[PDB]
Amino acid sequence: ALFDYNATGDTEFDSPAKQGWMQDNTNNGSGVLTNADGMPAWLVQGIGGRAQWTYSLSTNQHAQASSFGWRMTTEMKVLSGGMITNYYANGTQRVLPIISLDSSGNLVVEFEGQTGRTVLATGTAATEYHKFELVFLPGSNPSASFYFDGKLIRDNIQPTASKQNMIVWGNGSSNTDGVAAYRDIKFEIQGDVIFRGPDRIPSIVASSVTPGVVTAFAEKRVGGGDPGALSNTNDIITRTSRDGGITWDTELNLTEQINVSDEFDFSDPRPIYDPSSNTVLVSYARWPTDAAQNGDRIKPWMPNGIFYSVYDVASGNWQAPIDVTDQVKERSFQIAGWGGSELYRRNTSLNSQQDWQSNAKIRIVDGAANQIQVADGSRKYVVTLSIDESGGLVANLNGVSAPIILQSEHAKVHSFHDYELQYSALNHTTTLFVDGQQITTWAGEVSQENNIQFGNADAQIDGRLHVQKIVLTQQGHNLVEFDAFYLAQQTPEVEKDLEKLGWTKIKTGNTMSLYGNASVNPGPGHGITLTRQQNISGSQNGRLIYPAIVLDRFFLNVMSIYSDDGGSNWQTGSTLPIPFRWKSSSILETLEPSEADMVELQNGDLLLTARLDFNQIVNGVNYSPRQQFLSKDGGITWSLLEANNANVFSNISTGTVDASITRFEQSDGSHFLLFTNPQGNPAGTNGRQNLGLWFSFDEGVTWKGPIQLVNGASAYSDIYQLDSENAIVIVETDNSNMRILRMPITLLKQKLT
Ligand SMILES: CC(=O)N[C@H]1[C@H]([C@H](O)[C@H](O)CO)O[C@@](O)(C(=O)O)C[C@@H]1O
Numbered sequence: 001a002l003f004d005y006n007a008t009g010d011t012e013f014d015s016p017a018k019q020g021w022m023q024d025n026t027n028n029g030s031g032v033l034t035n036a037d038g039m040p041a042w043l044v045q046g047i048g049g050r051a052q053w054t055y056s057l058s059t060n061q062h063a064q065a066s067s068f069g070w071r072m073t074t075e076m077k078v079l080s081g082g083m084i085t086n087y088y089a090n091g092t093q094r095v096l097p098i099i100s101l102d103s104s105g106n107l108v109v110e111f112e113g114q115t116g117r118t119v120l121a122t123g124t125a126a127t128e129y130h131k132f133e134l135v136f137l138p139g140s141n142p143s144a145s146f147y148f149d150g151k152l153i154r155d156n157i158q159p160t161a162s163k164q165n166m167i168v169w170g171n172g173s174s175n176t177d178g179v180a181a182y183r184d185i186k187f188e189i190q191g192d193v194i195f196r197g198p199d200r201i202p203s204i205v206a207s208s209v210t211p212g213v214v215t216a217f218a219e220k221r222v223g224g225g226d227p228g229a230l231s232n233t234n235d236i237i238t239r240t241s242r243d244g245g246i247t248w249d250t251e252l253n254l255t256e257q258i259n260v261s262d263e264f265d266f267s268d269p270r271p272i273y274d275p276s277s278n279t280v281l282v283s284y285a286r287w288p289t290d291a292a293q294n295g296d297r298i299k300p301w302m303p304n305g306i307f308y309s310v311y312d313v314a315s316g317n318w319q320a321p322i323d324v325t326d327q328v329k330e331r332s333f334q335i336a337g338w339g340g341s342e343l344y345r346r347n348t349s350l351n352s353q354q355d356w357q358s359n360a361k362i363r364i365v366d367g368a369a370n371q372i373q374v375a376d377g378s379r380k381y382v383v384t385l386s387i388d389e390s391g392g393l394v395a396n397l398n399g400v401s402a403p404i405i406l407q408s409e410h411a412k413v414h415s416f417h418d419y420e421l422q423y424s425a426l427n428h429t430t431t432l433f434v435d436g437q438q439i440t441t442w443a444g445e446v447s448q449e450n451n452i453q454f455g456n457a458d459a460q461i462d463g464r465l466h467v468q469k470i471v472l473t474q475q476g477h478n479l480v481e482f483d484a485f486y487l488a489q490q491t492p493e494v495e496k497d498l499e500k501l502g503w504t505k506i507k508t509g510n511t512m513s514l515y516g517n518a519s520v521n522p523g524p525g526h527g528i529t530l531t532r533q534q535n536i537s538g539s540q541n542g543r544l545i546y547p548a549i550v551l552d553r554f555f556l557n558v559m560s561i562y563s564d565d566g567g568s569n570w571q572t573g574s575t576l577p578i579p580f581r582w583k584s585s586s587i588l589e590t591l592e593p594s595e596a597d598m599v600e601l602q603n604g605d606l607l608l609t610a611r612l613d614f615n616q617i618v619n620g621v622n623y624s625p626r627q628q629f630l631s632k633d634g635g636i637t638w639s640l641l642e643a644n645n646a647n648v649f650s651n652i653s654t655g656t657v658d659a660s661i662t663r664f665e666q667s668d669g670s671h672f673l674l675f676t677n678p679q680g681n682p683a684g685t686n687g688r689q690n691l692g693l694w695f696s697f698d699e700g701v702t703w704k705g706p707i708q709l710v711n712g713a714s715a716y717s718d719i720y721q722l723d724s725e726n727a728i729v730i731v732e733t734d735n736s737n738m739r740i741l742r743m744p745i746t747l748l749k750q751k752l753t
């Protein structure tokens with residue numbers, strides 16, 4: 001909440017009294033509106049008496065200020081005298097700076113409870129306008145910091161005993177004469193509730209084209225709880241502010257319109273602000289109301305998907321939801337030959353004396369030894385697909401020495417492609433076509449085998465491939481047909497077991513296979529629009545991107561979901577690379593990245609921070625509850641940053657929870673990163689308490705100790721830059737009530753060192 005006075009000549013507000021303040025003078029104390037350089041100001045005349053203005057707060061507001069912190073900003077000029085007291089007192093204590101001009105005319109400040117003084121300005125500057133700021137941070141040892149024209153003057157100011165209870169500005173003394181002119185006074189209490197529990201999972205973004213416009217989101221949880229519960233119906237809600245996050249409009253339900261009979265739960269609002277169009281595009285997940293991510297209950301044949309809504313900042317209008325599920329939710333049969341081999345073979349009766357054709361729509365997730373083969377009783381033709389050292393897609397044909405580079409662009413390297421083999425009986429050769437393009441022709445190798453086979457073929461070579469369709473035809477007749485794209489989306493009644501569909505499974509070592517992805521989810525927090533991609537091959541400025549959560553069947557991981565056309569068409573990137581180990585031919589030990597957030601570094605690389613759920617130890621290495629990753633290709637592929645985990649954030653909570661990360665750019669052009677997460681209580685322990693703020697001045701290599709922003713419950717949070725000097729934070733607190741904090745980042749940065 002904001003309590004202020006803005007000097008103006010406008011009749012309706014031409015005095016502090018018309019702006020809610022109460023006059024509190026004595027004897028000859030008075031005041032008058034003064035005009036100088038075309039800028040009005042209120043002149044406090046405390047000569048021969050006290051001259052001040054006060055604002056009373058409710059018992060509840062004082063309690064809120066003490067619990068969540070406050071900030072007082074003043075723009076004034078001291079003309080003469082002393083005891084210029086602009087401060088805040090509650091029914092117990094106060095932080096009191098005393099401003100004055102000394103006998104020589106210097107502008108100085110003293111603090112009740114401290115000895116001595118500090119000279120702020122001398123010469124003509126002593127009687128010119130200046131901006132004063134007092135910031136109070138909550139905590140076990142609450143203290144305030146004083147700033148003069150943006151510069152830290154005194155830190156760790158301890159509150160002093162006082163029975164006064166009110167916000168005050170002016171000359172607070174009947175005996176000491178003081179005269180000062182005020183252009184503006186602002187007292188702000190932090191922590192206003194924007195969304196009430198049981199609603200949860202906050203995110204926020206702000207407009208740079210239209211300063212002051214902020215849009216926040218959360219999950220409206222009727223019945224409470226995570227999505228997937230029969231006892232709840234969850235939707236996405238939003239509120240907008242046009243004054244920098246001070247006042248907010250009516251809570252708006254964005255998904256109710258596409259949840260007409262409460263058959264779904266919607267979750268994880270992931271907003272992205274696009275400066276090119278001055279719009280906010282928020283993506284979110286849909287789930288059948290009775291099954292979701294938790295416990296892997298969601299299945300490929302269920303209504304999980306992703307939708308987005310667009311907000312036009314200029315006119316302040318929202319647009320109806322748009323479904324993009326078919327673009328980002330993969331449907332396929334997946335074979336992970338990680339630590340083993342798994343092939344499927346169907347014996348056939350091909351006639352080598354006549355033409356035949358085979359088609360296989362395949363995507364290579366990683367590794368090698370991934371193949372598709374056809375043997376016709378005379379010759380065997382095998383295509384082995386792999387990812388080379390450069391990250392390109394390579395094909396090797398049996399009997400042909402030189403490998404064939406199919407794709408070099410990372411996005412194309414891991415996408416689905418249609419591999420068609422056309423055998424010519426007259427020419428005794430087979431031609432390979434990829435996506436309709438003729439690639440090469442070869443003779444294969446002598447063989448008496450007659451079959452079609454696919455999968456990962458080497459227990460000693462890791463590889464994962466996904467298949468959507470496999471067909472074999474001869475003389476206008478389909479000998480074999482496996483439509484995994486179709487089967488993945490069917491209910492359990494439909495037969496999907498390959499071994500029951502005419503195929504023989506040949507497996508060695510440890511492997512796993514499954515149908516399509518069970519679900520996709522944008523995750524909690526905000527997304528970003530890239531702007532420093534000029535030197536990133538395959539990427540582009542303007543790309544909209546967020547780190548989504550994908551569940552194949554049993555395990556969670558993160559992958560980028562992005563759009564290079566403003567949000568109309570979306571694509572997916574590769575999942576994060578994580579270690580794995582089989583404690584034997586049976587127990588899988590790996591990681592499960594989930595709630596993630598990313599930021600674009602100065603050189604175009606993307607830094608991602610992810611929550612690590614469930615198992616965190618692999619082969620004796622503890623990856624902690626949080627791990628950072630880096631992408632050098634616009635978010636298509638990632639690399640795990642060794643030793644860059646929870647340990648880089650001093651005093652961070654040891655419990656798994658969602659965090660937030662964002663870029664902050666100052667007016668001078670300089671920049672740095674901001675990160676929010678609970679510290680725990682005591683700090684460094686497991687608990688969703690005391691939200692902290694960390695800074696990185698070296699592109700995420702190191703972070704500077706946290707500044708505590710909240711004293712009490714603190715769970716999920718999101719932070720975003722509001723303007724050149726402030727950042728806005730939305731955070732879950734008591735009973736998950738989500739509150740707003742507006743932090744003076746350029747001032748707080750000075751409390752670090
Ligand atoms: C900042 C402050 O507390 N000012 C208070 C002063 C000071 O205690 C004395 O001037 C000594 O500095 O005492 C008053 O009775 C007064 O003079 O009007 C009330 C006023 O609120």
Ligand SMILES: [Ca+2]
Pocket residue numbers: 233256259262
């Ligand atoms: Ca409803």
Ligand SMILES: [Ca+2]
Pocket residue numbers: 227228229230231232233234264265288289290
């Ligand atoms: Ca539900």
Ligand SMILES: [Ca+2]
Pocket residue numbers: 524525526595596597658659660717
């Ligand atoms: Ca987050």
Ligand SMILES: [Ca+2]
Pocket residue numbers: 295296553554555556
């Ligand atoms: Ca699981």
